[PDB]
Enzyme design. Structure first.
Site, short mmCIF file in Angstrom:
data_model
loop_
_atom_site.label_atom_id
_atom_site.label_comp_id
_atom_site.label_asym_id
_atom_site.label_seq_id
_atom_site.Cartn_x
_atom_site.Cartn_y
_atom_site.Cartn_z
N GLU A 152 0.94 -1.44 0.10
CA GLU A 152 -0.15 -0.07 0.36
C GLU A 152 1.07 1.47 0.06
O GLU A 152 1.10 1.55 1.41
CB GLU A 152 -0.92 0.02 0.64
CG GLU A 152 -1.94 -0.70 0.85
CD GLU A 152 -2.38 -2.35 1.24
OE1 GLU A 152 -0.97 -3.00 0.69
OE2 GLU A 152 -3.01 -2.79 0.43
N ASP A 153 1.86 1.48 -1.13
CA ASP A 153 1.89 2.52 -1.23
C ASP A 153 3.38 2.74 -0.44
O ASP A 153 3.96 4.50 -0.50
CB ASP A 153 1.56 3.31 -1.85
CG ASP A 153 0.10 3.48 -2.88
OD1 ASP A 153 0.91 2.80 -3.68
OD2 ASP A 153 -0.40 3.80 -2.66
N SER A 154 3.61 2.08 0.56
CA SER A 154 5.33 2.51 0.98
C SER A 154 6.45 1.75 -0.34
O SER A 154 6.15 1.40 -0.53
CB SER A 154 5.33 0.75 2.45
OG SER A 154 6.57 1.07 2.69
#
Ligand SMILES: [Zn+2]
Ligand SMILES: [Zn+2]
Ligand SMILES: [Zn+2]
Ligand SMILES: [Zn+2]
Lengths: 56, 49, 53, 56, 49, 53, 56, 279, 44, 66, 147
Positions: K3-5
């Site tokens: 999730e967009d880390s």
């Protein structure tokens, strides 16, 4: 908060490299991607409170 | 014909200074003809911005 | 003073590496992506000639 | 209710005062005690009352 | 070892934001009191809650 | 310093200059060295001079 | 509303999360600066005496 | 009642105790013993982060007017009712004097410090039998100059009577009685940059004029009686020592000053041109 | 050496009111005293 | 600004050929591709570094402070 | 990454990716509150103030300022104030000596630490002693940055 979720309890393993850390499982009832949202934390003081958080 | 005119100069300069400092858009009358976002602090982060 | 490469790249002498084994897919540890052909959609290795087809 | 509500009490004759904690002096950090809104308005009330009583 | 799939991978343009972590880390226990309400005061600046 | 650059910038710029490294086994690590503050056995000293001429 | 059914608190933390695939659900990752900042009361028994003395 | 809290550690008692404050937790601890004294400190900066009473006095000023969620029919009643209590206080005359000295100081473009010091000078006496009226403007003309000079700012009489014609002597007697009032209740070098400001000169003539004024103050030749004018002719002799056409008629019309006194100072420094130049 | 004030590389040595507007320069901004005292840094 | 030191991608010493890369434009009228060829960085990983560096230190230093 | 880390190379951070300056400024000036004598920018001694901080005030000099180029921690003091009232029973009334401080010296914001640089002082609009400072602080990118 919207419903009975967002209120989990946890145990702790203490981590360096200062930030939070949590399981990828519980992310969607938390209703939060990693887009920079911030969390809020509280610590109980007495044993009745700590026990009822632990058991419920 | 001199004493009043220089405090008149203070009133005009002070009024324009107060207006372009605050963004309340009017004279000293507590937000009459009032709309706020006219004197924004300039955005100074990046040349593109 | 002395220092080593593992804690900071200041003491790294290497700053490049190259690594190859089985240029001709004989061990078949991986396939190749393709859209119509495995062969023509990829170039040969430079290390091609030292092992037979 | 007779014991607690009788309409002459509903008309104001004698006015209680609020204590200093509700209207605290902010001690405005260079020289002022920084008196605030409630004490200000009460001082206005006393001034108007003493003016009316001298006038009558 | 060899990797099973293959990877789209290469040069790209990124950029850096402003909300860095040191302005947002904040914690407190038994600190300053607001005289109007006897509650913990506001503000990360004056060590709020 | 007098330049239009700043000082730790000059430091990190300096940090990547490599040096001669033959006899590096002869000297000792400062962590294991018995002394304090860069004896001649455990470190070397560098001087730089520039001018606006 | 801003003072009785909700207010400010104590023992509070506020940071930004990252994921992890190695911590199960009942744990949470907590940074050590925050663990220095926070606290929790205990009691003195014959059971906890030596560990508490060592930690003091 | 003695109105007094003293803080003392109940276990050290060495003195009025050597104690410290931990503002980050709002507590106080005797530094020797290490025990708390009291808790829950009140902040001393957040109120200044939150939001002229000495000149307005103990009674507090209040201007009233209109708003958005009100009616014009009664805010005009309010506008004609705002003067129904100005006669109860003398603070209407205090604020009229404050408004008029604001008129004067900002008319002469004087700063906030000069304005507040003139406010202080009026508020100091504000009522004596020595004051006794005296046109009501003589007291303000005195007070603005008193606050100006005590702000280490010099302004000319000719500026003061260009502001208000106070016949120059009711002004003088008001200055004397105020001087006695302030001394009971208890400098011309800065005229030079305003003169060269009106004349438009660089620095070295001004520094030379200051040096020559210091030297002529030290030696002799008062010679002009109000040495404002011998300061002015020190600028004249400096600018004639250089080669910029700032001729005597131009200086006299610019400064509204006597040209015969300029020639007298020119002669007396024509004698004494020797020891007055450093480089 | 206490003040610089300008484009001069001069150690003006001003202390108190000796024509603060600089003599061999033309400035009124009074640059102040780059420090003689030894500094410490940490380049890790 | 300053052309940096030790490429993020490869890591070899970069900027030796910098003012070289300059003077192969003006007095040679030389196209950049063959100019990088003869310059001799056979990878691209360092070729991009000099390709997209923009000088700023000239515009910096043509002030006159102090 | 989930999730967009982001995963990054700390060796590239060591090589010098994404390093950044951070300038911060401060506004401070004095007032007249009398009996026209203004405040002062003094260097505090032990017996100087009213309700002194724990600032460890050694970083200041005789002009009440800090010389640039030295390092400062979070709680450290940079400016010094003193109350010029005159008349309020100036240094012998209701206080020790510790003369007339009521000291409102501005500490730095208690977290960030770095190097002060290029302190300027110039009179304000009306003519007072008016002070601005600037502190320089490197911030290497860390785990918690928004990219
Ligand atoms: Zn050694
Ligand atoms: Zn004690
Ligand atoms: Zn200069
Ligand atoms: Zn490369």
């Amino acid at each position: 908060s919207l419903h009975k979720m967002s209120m989990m309890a946890h145990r702790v393993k203490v981590i360096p490299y200062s930030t939070f850390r949590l399981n990828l499982s519980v992310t969607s009832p938390y209703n939060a991607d990693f887009d920079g949202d911030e969390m809020n934390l509280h610590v109980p003081q007495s044993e009745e409170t700590r026990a009822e958080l632990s058991q419920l | 014909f001199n004493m009043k005119l220089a405090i008149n100069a203070k009133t005009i300069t002070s009024g324009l200074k107060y207006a372009l400092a605050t963004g309340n858009w009017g004279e000293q009358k507590k937000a009459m003809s009032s709309r706020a976002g006219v004197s924004q602090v300039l955005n100074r982060y990046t040349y593109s911005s | 003073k002395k220092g080593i490469a593992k804690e900071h790249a200041k003491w790294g002498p290497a700053a490049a590496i190259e690594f190859e084994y089985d240029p001709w897919n004989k061990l078949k540890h991986t396939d190749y992506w393709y859209e119509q052909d495995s062969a023509k959609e990829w170039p040969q290795s430079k290390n091609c000639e030292y092992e037979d087809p | 209710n007779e014991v607690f509500s009788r309409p002459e009490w509903m008309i104001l004759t004698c006015l209680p005062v609020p204590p200093p904690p509700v209207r605290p002096s902010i001690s405005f950090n260079e020289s002022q005690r920084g008196e605030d809104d409630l004490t200000f308005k009460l001082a206005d009330i006393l001034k108007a009352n003493i003016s009316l009583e001298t006038l009558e | 070892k060899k990797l099973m799939a293959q990877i789209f991978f290469g040069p790209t343009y990124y950029q850096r934001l402003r909300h860095m972590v040191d302005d947002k880390i904040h914690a407190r226990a038994r600190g300053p009191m607001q005289v109007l309400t006897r509650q913990p005061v506001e503000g990360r600046s004056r060590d709020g809650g | 310093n007098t330049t239009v650059l700043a000082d730790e910038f000059i430091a990190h710029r300096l940090g990547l200059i490599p040096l001669q490294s033959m006899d590096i086994e002869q000297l000792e690590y400062s962590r294991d060295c018995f002394c304090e503050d860069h004896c001649d056995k455990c470190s070397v000293v560098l001087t730089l001079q520039a001018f606006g001429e | 509303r801003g003072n009785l059914m909700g207010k400010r608190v104590d023992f509070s933390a506020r940071t930004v999360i990252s994921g992890d695939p190695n911590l199960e659900l009942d744990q949470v990752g907590v940074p050590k600066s925050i663990a220095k900042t926070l606290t929790y009361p205990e009691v003195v028994t014959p059971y906890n005496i030596d560990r508490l003395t060592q930690l003091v | 009642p003695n109105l007094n809290i003293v803080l003392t550690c109940p276990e050290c008692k060495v003195y009025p105790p050597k104690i410290v404050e931990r503002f980050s937790e709002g507590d106080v601890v005797c530094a020797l013993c290490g025990l708390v004294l009291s808790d829950k400190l009140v902040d001393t900066r957040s109120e200044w982060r939150t939001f002229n009473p000495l000149l307005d006095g103990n009674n507090l000023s209040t201007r009233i007017g209109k708003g958005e969620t009100t009616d014009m029919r009664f805010t005009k009643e309010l506008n004609k009712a705002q003067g129904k209590n100005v006669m109860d206080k003398k603070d209407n005359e205090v604020q009229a004097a404050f408004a008029k000295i604001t008129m004067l100081c900002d008319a002469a473009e004087l700063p906030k410090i000069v304005k507040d010091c003139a406010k202080e000078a009026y508020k100091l006496c504000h009522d004596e039998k020595t004051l006794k009226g005296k046109s009501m403007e003589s007291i303000m003309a005195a007070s603005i100059l008193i606050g100006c000079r005590r702000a280490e700012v010099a302004r000319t009489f000719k500026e003061i009577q260009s502001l208000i014609h106070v016949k120059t002597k009711e002004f003088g007697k008001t200055l004397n009685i105020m001087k006695n009032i302030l001394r009971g209740k208890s400098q011309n070098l800065t005229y030079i940059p305003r003169f060269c400001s009106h004349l438009g000169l660089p620095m070295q003539v001004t520094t030379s004029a200051e040096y020559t004024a210091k030297k002529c103050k030290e030696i002799k030749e008062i010679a002009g009686k109000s040495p404002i004018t011998i300061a002015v002719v020190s600028i004249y002799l400096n600018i004639l020592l250089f080669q910029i056409p700032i001729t005597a008629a131009k200086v006299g019309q610019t400064l509204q000053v006597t040209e015969g006194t300029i020639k007298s100072g020119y002669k007396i420094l024509y004698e004494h041109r020797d020891k007055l130049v450093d480089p | 050496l206490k003040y610089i004030c300008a484009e001069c590389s001069s150690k003006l040595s001003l202390s108190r009111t000796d024509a603060v507007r600089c003599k061999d320069c033309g400035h009124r901004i009074l640059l102040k005293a780059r420090t003689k005292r030894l500094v410490q840094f940490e380049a890790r | 600004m300053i052309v940096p030191v030790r490429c993020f991608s490869c890591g070899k010493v970069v900027g030796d050929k910098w003012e070289s890369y300059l003077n192969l434009l003006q007095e040679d009228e030389l196209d950049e591709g063959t100019a990088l060829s003869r310059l001799g960085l056979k990878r691209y990983c360092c070729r991009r570094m000099i390709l997209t560096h923009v000088d700023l230190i000239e515009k910096f230093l043509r002030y006159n402070p102090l | 990454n989930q999730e967009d880390s982001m995963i990054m190379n700390q060796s590239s951070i060591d090589r010098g990716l994404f390093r950044s300056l951070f300038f911060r400024s401060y506004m401070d000036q004095e007032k007249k509150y009398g009996m026209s004598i203004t405040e002062t920018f003094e260097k505090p001694q032990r017996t100087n103030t009213l309700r002194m901080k724990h600032g460890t005030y050694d970083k200041l000099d005789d002009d009440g300022l800090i010389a640039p180029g030295v390092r400062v921690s979070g709680e450290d003091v940079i400016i010094g104030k003193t109350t010029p009232i005159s008349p309020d029973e100036e240094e012998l009334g209701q206080r020790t000596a510790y003369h007339s401080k009521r000291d409102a010296s501005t500490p730095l914001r208690s977290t960030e630490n770095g190097i002060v640089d290029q302190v300027l002082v110039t009179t304000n609009q009306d003519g007072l002693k008016f002070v601005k400072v600037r502190v320089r602080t490197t911030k290497i990118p860390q785990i918690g940055d928004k990219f």
